[PDB]
């Protein structure tokens, strides 16, 4: 009764919202937050695709996606803690000296 | 089932929109938790009961707890509000809008017989996970071990 | 399908690398011994090579709905394992200079080798996604292993953020493809489309998002800007492992995906990949023109060489020798980049600390270390495509595959980018034999030295005499 | 859709809204009526909780279908739990799970 | 119509269960403290007391934390079957829904500590949050022993699977780990106050403080009822009605929580984390492995 198209469009909306939140923010924490939004949107799209076909594979890919999201959130917050404890500044544009 | 799906999708979209524009980190994380709860409600509308339970247990109950922990220990760019003035988000917003309109053009035009909403239980997901998905399970434990090792190596104080 | 005992006899390198991970981890939990843990890592990788020989005694079979093991998979597994062994060998003097925990580096290197093996045997979207994450996140750890170093922390943050974004793109594309196809197997990606309906927009857009993620992973233009910063900031053995193992494993699974997907011979994806290959070759060669940093220069070089590989990939279904060309090119590129980043590793070893500069200064290298200057020159000529080297044999293979498929724009791009490459590679080599104005004693440094000399001897011998490697690659046919 | 399942859906929804409304009305009556007049170990503990929670989800999925998975599934969970215990042992011996050094 | 009076009877049963649970939590606040109207006395004392939000604090987070501390375990009660025909939601996920509410419960402590504009209260909240995460990490597996024996996430199916042998005997290690995890997730003695670190309930006064207290005792009601349902056969009894048996077993566990508070002493903070992780997590993994081997052998 629910269209697959509507669930896919909802996942796409959340994905592009996470992408623009990733781009527009100088603070690294909001960049990590936008990354979490994008990966949650991708997992939602996999759930919609799996539930449309009546298959278990969508929830399995969802489980793999949230395992990835947990590990990436852990690593990114470790890197953010390192940046804050070595520079006392979460500005990502200051971490830019390698260029050319 | 359609009613809950549409309200939860709308709540998730609205909460994400408040997430990416807010200035306070704790408030943004609270809106993100609200969006995760809405996404779990969407999962329960589709019949993916295990996915909704996992969206509350693992995403809102573990990962956002980690983000909240980091924000509290930071005790925290905020003052100027760069992302609010249109001269900063003029480009990225229309770029994301163009990407979204191309994606939803691809979405419109596919075979769509509708979603039945029959519950795919966690028992069947377990049979699949521990049937034809042995290497996904073992290497996913392997991946989480890798993430644990990396995050301890980087995030410890000394 | 389920698991048989013979399926376990078609799984040994994965199990060997995983058991090496567990054993090294428990040995770290026992005590913090750099020598013993590094040795356990290299014995585990060598045993995985011997396990590859043992499964070469066995046949080719589909071990899961996920995995498929054939000679294609064994060839790419061997390339990944050789890259990992070289990385550990270069990492030991570097980690000897590193005044912190050292064996976590080996644990992450082994875990990334496991992900490379998974990508080498992947026949399924779930396995491809898992292998990509399994080579990515240990590289998050390894690129910023020296997180107190400001350049390494910068490279870690850049690679972590950008690879998380690319993983999101790839996952979204996989979800759209599964929404269309209804099956995550490689062979079913387009099976439910017939009568010329192969160009369905949802399948194409899903493959486009996967192309964005994979082309980030392959340093393809315009997902290439991370490459010089991440290459320069990362530790030099980590740069070696990234440039060799990650790109080889991801391009192998991309080769398999475009081989068994029925949507692989759509004209739209072929044209997009042709544009990406053209831009990658030209942009990498042009951007490496005025580089005084060897690591950034090798990043741009990696962009151009993956453009050549993409040119070989486009001629898959039209031609026949495309996968053989990819194998020969991958062997030559593996040995060349191994030797190049190995010299970068040993001259930057031991690690001098987070505050000291890691500048290379290759000018005048002959007058204080002649043999490493000779090996650097040999690999510079190999990446240029000089006929006395196996890099030319790969260039000749991709040129033959572009001529057979009549890809004249890509052939002209190869020639022009080759000329620009001649300029900057020969500048690097003649700088090695210039005069420097002004400016070890272990056996693991000598092990890294003999590794780069062995790679030079292999690239020179297979440049003059390429037939053994050609016959090695040719027998590695997969289950068609 | 049976009568019992929609009755239970209505009962669950009423349970939700009565509980939330009772708490909100409790705080509203509290406010309206009356007379006016850090160390990195926290991040590591939360991170360990997240990782082991995802492993716990895999074990959750196994546990509900034991009779439909056979001894092969037990073996699968055996290497899974062995790697989990190896990681836990690793964290214990390296001092990661040691609040007091 | 029979359908309308059936759904209204089910709604009335759910509301009766909810009111009984709330009144039981408040009445056992009194019982942990003849004087039946004493509870009403403190109730209207906190009701009519003026409320003080700190001036330089965050209003929404400060107001939101007691709501979480109440509604999390209050909603977690909804899966518990009391008697045949007296369940609120016969969910397919069940104990997963309990795990969802227990996961959301940590935000009350974190939010209270941050919104209370005080470094000491913030440090105490981080300490308590680390503790409850350290015990929530094995709460689910301690219940997975029972789930593995029953082969389903449903609660009525678990109670029907307890029709001959109660799961206290085969899942005694699951019994012990779920008891410790239920006590620790409720932030009560001996896991009551882990605190330069002060309490995170400071700056809370009046009806918000009442919300925190009644939410803790409601969580005690929910944990004891789920304890009975999972490990002590639920409502199954030979002579008395099933409602009566469930009531006596729930009261039995609730006064044993009170007795554990009144008797046991408080271990140290690092001792609490070391015990939690190092003992209870490998013990629970081993318990689930041995349980699986036993059921597959039979
Ligand atoms: C009221 C107007 C809006 C007011 C403001 C927003 C309030 C919250 C709105 C979202 C949550 C409630 C949505 C409405 C649910 C009502 C019940 C319903 O529609 O149930 C249908 C279905 C029952 O299951 P099924 O067996 O599939 O039945 C289908 C036909 N027989 O149900 C299902 O399949 C699943 C039911 C939903 C999933 C469980 C509940 C999820 C709750 C998510 C909360 C998100 C955070 C909210 C934050 C609010 C503040 C911003
Ligand atoms: C008759 C027409 C039909 C036949 C056409 C045949 C084509 C192949 C044969 C002709 C090739 C002509 C090449 C001309 C440039 C040769 C290289 C050169 O002059 O390099 C010197 C110069 C460096 O000088 P310097 O001042 O030291 O640099 C600044 C830093 N110190 O170097 C530089 O500034 C950078 C050099 C970059 C690499 C060289 C340029 C390559 C361009 C593509 C070549 C391929 C052919 C394209 C078409 C050519 C015209 C038809
Ligand atoms: C501060 C407020 C925050 C937001 C609070 C909630 C807002 C919405 C409130 C109104 C909700 C109305 C009820 C919604 C429908 C309930 C029934 C339902 O979900 O039925 C669907 C499904 C049935 O499945 P089952 O019965 O097992 O199988 C047979 C299938 N016919 O059953 C299921 O899928 C059951 C699983 C889903 C149950 C969700 C219950 C609410 C969860 C959110 C709690 C939030 C707590 C507060 C915030 C915490 C901190 C952030
Ligand atoms: C096919 C490979 C061709 C290049 C080989 C490079 C290494 C050869 C062995 C070392 C030779 C070094 C010669 C240095 C001469 C310096 C003269 C300076 C004064 C004019
Ligand atoms: C910036 C560098 C640009 C390099 C461009 C190199 C171009 C080389 C020459 C390409 C010629 C292609 C001719 C294609 C003809 C196809 C005819 C098809 C007939 C059916
Ligand atoms: C009915 C009796 C059956 C007895 C034998 C049961 C076990 C047989 C099959 C064993 C399969 C083991 C698979 C292990 C996979 C490990 C993957 C590790 C990846 C790193």
Sort E13 into a burial class: Cβ within 10 Å, 0-12 / 13-18 / 19+: middle
B111's tokens: 């075979």
If one counts every other C-beta atom within 10 angstroms of the C-beta of residue E27, the result is 15
* 3 state DSSP class of E37: coil
Compute the distance between CA of residue C250 and CA of residue C74 in angstroms, rounded to an integer: 15
Output the CA torsion C180→C183→C188→C194 (10° steps). -40
B/e letters for E232-249, b = 16+ CB within 10 Å, e = fewer, are bbbbbeeeeebeebbbeb
* Domains of chain A and CATH, by start: 4-87 (1.10.287.3510)
D60, D61, D63, D66 alpha-carbon torsion, rounded to 10°:
180
Q: Does the beta carbon of D94 lie under 8 angstroms from any beta carbon of chain A? A: no
Q: For CA atoms A19, A23, A27, A28, give the dihedral sign.
A: positive
**Ligand 1 pocket, residue B37 CB under 6 Å:** yes
d(CA D27, CA E208): 7
The alpha carbon of B76 is separated from its chain's Cα centroid by a whole number of angstroms, namely 24
Contact B106, A4 (CB under 8 A): no
**Token pair listed for C256:** 């398999």
Distance CA C412, CA C402 (A): 10
Beta bridge partners of residue A2, listed in sequence order: B115
Measured by CA distance, the residue closest to atom 1 of ligand 5 is C282
Give the Cα separation of C356 and E37 in Å (integer): 74
DSSP state of B55: I
- Matching residue, tokens 């060997």: C16
Cβ(A13)–Cβ(B13) under 8 Å? yes
Q: Are C352 and C391 within 8 A, CB to CB? A: no
Helix B86-107, helix A4-24: angle, nearest 10? 160
Please give the backbone phi and psi of residue C69, each rounded to the nearest 5 degrees, phi first. Answer: -115, 120
3-state secondary structure chain C: CCCCHHHHCCCHHHHHHHHHHHHHHHHHHHCCCHHHHHHHHHHHHHHHHHHHHHHHHCCCECCCCCECECHHHHHHHHHHHHHHHHHHHHHHHHHHCCCCCCHHHHHHHHHHHHHHHHHHCECEHHHHHHHHHHHHHHHHHHHCCCCCCHHHHHHHHHHHHHHHHHHHHHHHHHHHHHHHHCCCEHHHCCCCCCCCCCCCHHHHHHHHHHHHHHHHHCCCCCCCCHHHHHHHHCCHHHHHHHHHHHHHHHHHHHHHHHHHCHHHHCHHHHHHHHHHHHHHHHHHHHHCCCCCCHHHHHHHHHHHHHHHHHHHHHCCCCCCCHHHHHHHHHHHHHHHHHHHHHHHHHHCCCCCCCCCCCCCCCCCHHHCCHHHHHHHHHHHHHHHCCCCCHHHHHHHHHHHHHHHCCCHHHHHHHHHHHHHHHHHHHHHHHHHCCCCCCCCCCCHHHHHHHHHHHHHHHHHHHHHCCHHHHHHHHCCCCCC
- The stretches of D1-101 forming alpha helices (DSSP H) are 3-32, 41-63, 70-93
Instruction: Show Cβ contacts of residue E257 under 8 Å, excluding neighbours closer than 6 positions.
Output: E183, E188, E220, E223, E224
Kindly report the backbone phi and psi dihedral angles of residue E291, in degrees, each rounded to the nearest multiple of 5, phi listed first: -60, -45
- Distance, in Å, from the CA atom of E204 to the CA atom of E54, rounded to the nearest integer, reads 9
φ, ψ for residue D67, nearest 5 deg: -70, -15
List all residues 6 or more positions away from C194 whose beta carbon is below 8 Å from its beta carbon: none
Q: How far apart are CA C398 and CA C404, in angstroms?
A: 10
Q: Assess contact for E116 and E202: CB atoms under 8 A.
A: yes
**Token pair in block for residue C463:** 């440049």
Rounded Cα gap, residues C112 and C106, in angstroms = 10
Dihedrals phi, psi of C124, to nearest 5 degrees: -170, 145
Q: Measured from the CA of C416, which atom of ligand 5 is nearest?
A: 4
Contact C193, C200 (CB under 8 A): yes
Backbone angles phi, psi at C185, to 5 degrees: -70, 150
- State how far the Cα of C422 lies from the Cα of E210, in Å rounded to an integer: 78
Pick left, alpha or beta for residue E180 (phi over 0 → left; psi -120 to 50 → alpha; otherwise beta). Answer: alpha
The closest alpha carbon to E21, from E79, E90, E106, belongs to E79
Q: Tell me which chain D residue has its CA closest to the CA of residue B134.
A: D76
Phi-psi region of C441 (alpha: psi -120 to 50; beta: other; left: phi over 0): left
Residue pointed to by tokens 């060349």: C336
Q: How many CB atoms lie within 10 A of CB C250?
A: 24
**Cβ–Cβ of A76/C296 closer than 8 Å?**
no
Nearest to E74 by CA among E151, E22, E8: E22
Instruction: Tell me the residues of chain A between 27 and 86 that have a Cβ less than 8 Å away from chain C.
Output: 28, 31-32, 35, 38-39, 41-43, 45-46, 48-50, 52-53, 55, 57-58, 60-61, 64-65, 68, 71-72, 75-76, 79, 82-83, 86
- Are B65 and E133 within 8 A, CB to CB? yes
CA gap E261, E192 in Å, rounded = 9
- Residue A25 main-chain phi, psi, to 5 deg: -105, 130
Write the burial class of residue C447 (CB in 10 Å: 0-12 exposed, 13-18 middle, 19+ buried).
middle
- Using CA atoms in the order A36, A37, A40, A45, what is the torsion angle rounded to 10 degrees? -150
Contact between D47 and A63 using a beta-carbon 8 Å cutoff: no
In sequence order, what are the residues at sequence separation of 6 or more whose Cβ sits closer than 8 angstroms to the Cβ of residue E40? Answer: none
Question: Which helix (H) or strand (E) covers residue B106, if one does?
Answer: helix B86-107
Class for domain D11-100, per CATH? mainly alpha
Question: Is-cis flag, bond preceding C350, omega within 30?
Answer: yes
Q: Which residues contact C308 (CB under 8 A, 6 or more apart)?
A: C277, C281, C329, C394, C395, C398, C414
Q: Are E270 and E134 in contact (CB under 8 A)?
A: no
CA distance D94 to C203: 48
What is the distance between the alpha carbons of residues E153 and B119, in angstroms, rounded to a whole number?
Answer: 14
With b for 16 or more beta-carbon neighbours within 10 A and e for fewer, the C327-341 pattern comes to bbbbbbbbbbbbbbb
In chain E, the N- to C-terminal Cα span, in Å, equals 49
- Structural domain boundaries in chain D: 11-100
**Contact at 8 Å (CB) between D63 and E290?**
no
DSSP E54: -
User: Quick count: other Cβ atoms within 10 Å of Cβ B154?
Assistant: 24
Residue with CA at minimum distance from ligand 3 atom 17: D9
Domains of chain B: 1-155 (1.20.120.1200)
Whole-angstrom distance, CA of residue C309 vs CA of residue C291: 23
Map tokens 């069940």 to a residue. Answer: E94
The method recorded for this entry reads cryo-EM
Q: Considering only CA atoms, which residue is closest to atom 7 of ligand 5?
A: C412
Least Cα distance to E159 among E86, E104, E63, E65 occurs for E86
Q: Which of C3, C18, C29 minimises the CB distance to D90?
A: C29
- Name the packing angle between helices D3-32 and E59-76 (round to 10°): 140
**Eight-class DSSP state of B61:** I
In the three-class reduction of DSSP (H, G, I as helix; E, B as strand; rest coil), residue A56 is classed as coil
Beta-bridge partners for C69 = C61
Q: Ligand 4 within 6 A of C388 CB?
A: yes
Any idea what the Cα angle at residue A92 is, between residues B69 and A85, rounded to 5°? Answer: 50
CA–CA separation, C147 and D5 (whole Å): 56
Chain B residues touching residue A81 (CB < 8 angstroms):
70, 154-155
Only one residue has tokens 């409850």, namely E132
Number of CB atoms found within 10 A of residue C416's CB:
14
Chain D hits for A73, CB-CB cut-off 8 Å, are: 50
Q: Are C402 and C417 in contact (CB under 8 A)?
A: no
**CA torsion sign, C90 to C96 to C98 to C102?**
positive
E96: Cβ contacts below 8 Å, ≥ 6 apart: B49, B50, B53, B57, B122, D60, E153
φ/ψ of B88, rounded to 5, equals -95, -50
């Amino acid at each position: 009764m629910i269209p697959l198209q509507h669930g896919l469009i909802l996942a796409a909306i959340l994905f592009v919202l996470g992408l623009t939140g990733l781009v527009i923010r100088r603070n690294l924490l909001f960049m990590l937050i936008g990354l979490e939004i994008m990966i949650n949107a991708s997992a939602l799209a996999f759930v919609v695709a799996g539930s449309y076909w009546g298959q278990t594979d969508g929830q399995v890919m969802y489980i793999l996606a949230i395992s990835l999201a947990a590990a990436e959130a852990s690593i990114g917050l470790a890197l953010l803690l390192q940046l804050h404890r070595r520079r006392q500044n979460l500005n990502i544009d200051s971490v830019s000296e390698m260029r050319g | 089932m359609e009613f809950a799906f549409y309200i939860c999708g709308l709540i998730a979209i609205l909460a994400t929109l408040r997430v990416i524009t807010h200035t306070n980190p704790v408030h943004a994380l609270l809106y993100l938790i609200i969006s995760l709860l809405a996404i779990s409600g969407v999962f329960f509308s589709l019949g993916a009961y295990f996915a909704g339970a996992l969206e509350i247990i693992v995403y809102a109950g573990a990962i956002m707890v980690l983000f909240v922990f980091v924000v509290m220990m930071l005790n925290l760019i905020e003052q100027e509000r760069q992302w609010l003035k249109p001269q900063v988000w003029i480009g990225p917003a229309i770029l994301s809008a163009i990407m979204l309109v191309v994606i939803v053009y691809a979405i419109l035009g596919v075979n769509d017989q509708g979603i039945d909403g029959t519950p795919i239980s966690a028992k069947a997901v377990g049979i699949t996970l521990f049937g034809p998905y042995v290497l996904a399970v073992e290497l996913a434990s392997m991946l989480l071990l890798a993430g644990l090792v990396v995050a301890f190596h980087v995030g410890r104080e000394e | 399908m389920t698991i048989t005992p013979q399926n376990l006899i078609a799984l040994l390198p994965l199990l060997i690398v995983g058991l090496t991970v567990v054993v090294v981890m428990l040995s770290i939990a026992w005590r913090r011994n750099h020598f013993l843990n590094a040795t356990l890592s290299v014995i585990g990788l060598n045993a995985a090579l011997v396990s590859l020989w043992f499964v070469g005694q066995a046949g080719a079979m589909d071990v899961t709905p996920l995995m498929r093991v054939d000679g294609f998979a064994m060839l790419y597994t061997g390339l990944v394992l050789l890259a990992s062994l070289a990385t550990c060998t270069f990492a030991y003097p570097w980690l000897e200079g590193y005044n912190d925990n050292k064996d976590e580096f080996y644990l992450l290197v082994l875990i990334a080798a496991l992900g490379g093996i998974l990508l080498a045997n992947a026949n399924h979207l779930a396995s491809l996604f898992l292998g990509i994450e399994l080579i990515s996140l240990p590289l998050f750890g390894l690129v910023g292993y020296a997180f107190r170093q400001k350049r390494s922390l910068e490279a870690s943050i850049k690679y972590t953020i950008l690879s998380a974004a690319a993983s999101s793109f790839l996952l979204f594309g996989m979800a759209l493809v599964y929404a269309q196809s209804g099956d995550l197997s490689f062979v079913a990606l387009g099976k439910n489309l017939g009568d010329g309906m192969l160009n369905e927009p949802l399948l194409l857009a899903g493959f486009g998002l996967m192309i964005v993620g994979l082309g980030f992973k392959l340093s393809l233009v315009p997902f290439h800007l991370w490459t010089p910063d991440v290459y320069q900031g990362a530790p030099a053995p980590v740069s070696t492992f990234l440039a060799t193992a990650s790109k080889i494993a991801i391009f192998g699974v991309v080769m398999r995906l475009f081989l068994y997907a029925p949507v692989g011979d759509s004209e739209a994806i072929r044209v997009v990949l042709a544009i990406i290959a053209f831009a990658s070759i030209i942009f990498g060669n042009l951007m490496a023109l005025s580089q005084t940093n060897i690591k950034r220069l090798l990043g741009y070089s990696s962009i151009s060489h993956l453009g050549y590989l993409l040119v070989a990939l486009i001629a898959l279904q039209t031609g026949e020798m495309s996968m053989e060309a990819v194998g020969v090119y991958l062997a030559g590129y593996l040995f060349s980049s191994l030797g190049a980043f190995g010299v970068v590793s040993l001259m930057s070893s031991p690690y001098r600390g987070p505050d000291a500069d890691s500048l290379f200064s290759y000018r005048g290298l002959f007058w204080h270390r002649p043999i490493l200057a000779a090996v650097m020159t040999v690999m510079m000529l190999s990446l240029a495509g000089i006929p006395m080297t196996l890099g030319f044999i790969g260039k000749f293979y991709v040129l033959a595959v572009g001529v057979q498929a009549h890809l004249w724009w890509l052939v002209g791009a190869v020639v022009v980018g080759s000329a620009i490459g001649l300029y900057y590679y020969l500048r690097v080599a003649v700088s090695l034999y210039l005069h420097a104005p002004e400016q070890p004693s272990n056996w693991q440094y000598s092990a890294g030295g003999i590794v780069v000399l062995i790679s030079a001897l292999l690239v020179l011998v297979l440049g003059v005499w390429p037939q053994p490697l050609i016959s090695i690659v040719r027998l590695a046919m997969p289950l068609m | 859709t049976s009568t019992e399942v929609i009755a239970h859906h209505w009962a669950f929804a009423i349970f939700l809204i009565v509980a939330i409304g009772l708490c909100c009305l409790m705080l509203v009556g509290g406010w309206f009526l009356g007379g006016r007049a850090l160390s990195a170990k926290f991040y590591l503990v939360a991170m360990f909780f997240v990782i082991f929670d995802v492993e716990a989800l895999y074990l959750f999925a196994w546990s509900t279908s034991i009779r439909e998975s056979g001894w092969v599934g037990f073996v699968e969970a055996a290497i899974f739990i062995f790697v989990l215990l190896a990681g836990l042992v690793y964290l214990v011996r390296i001092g990661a799970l040691d609040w007091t050094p | 119509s029979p359908e309308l009076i059936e759904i209204l009877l089910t709604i009335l049963k759910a509301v009766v269960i909810l009111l009984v649970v709330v009144t039981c939590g408040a009445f056992m606040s009194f019982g942990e403290r003849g004087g039946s109207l004493q509870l009403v006395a403190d109730m209207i004392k906190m009701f009519f007391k003026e409320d003080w939000i700190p001036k330089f604090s965050d209003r929404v987070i400060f107001t939101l934390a007691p709501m979480i501390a109440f509604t999390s375990l209050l909603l977690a009660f909804a899966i518990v079957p009391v008697s045949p025909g007296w369940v609120v939601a016969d969910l397919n996920i069940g104990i997963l829904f309990f795990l969802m509410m227990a996961g959301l419960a940590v935000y009350a402590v974190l939010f209270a500590g941050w919104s209370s504009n005080n470094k000491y209260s913030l440090l105490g909240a981080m300490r308590a949050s680390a503790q409850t995460l350290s015990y929530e990490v094995f709460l689910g597996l301690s219940l997975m022993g029972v789930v593995a024996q029953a082969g389903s996430f449903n609660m009525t199916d678990i109670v029907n699977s307890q029709a001959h042998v109660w799961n206290v005997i085969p899942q005694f290690f699951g019994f012990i780990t779920f008891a410790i995890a239920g006590v620790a997730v409720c932030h009560r003695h001996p896991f009551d106050q882990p605190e330069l670190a002060d309490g995170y309930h400071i700056e809370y006064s009046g009806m918000k403080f009442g919300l925190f207290f009644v939410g803790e005792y409601i969580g005690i009601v929910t944990i004891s009822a789920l304890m009975v349902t999972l490990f002590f056969g639920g409502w199954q009894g030979p002579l008395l009605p099933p409602f009566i048996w469930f009531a006596l077993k729930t009261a039995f566990f609730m006064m044993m929580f009170i007795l554990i508070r009144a008797s046991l002493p408080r271990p140290r903070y690092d001792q609490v984390m070391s015990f939690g992780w190092k003992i209870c997590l490998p013990l629970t993994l081993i318990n689930l492995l041995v349980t699986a081997a036993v059921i597959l052998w039979q």
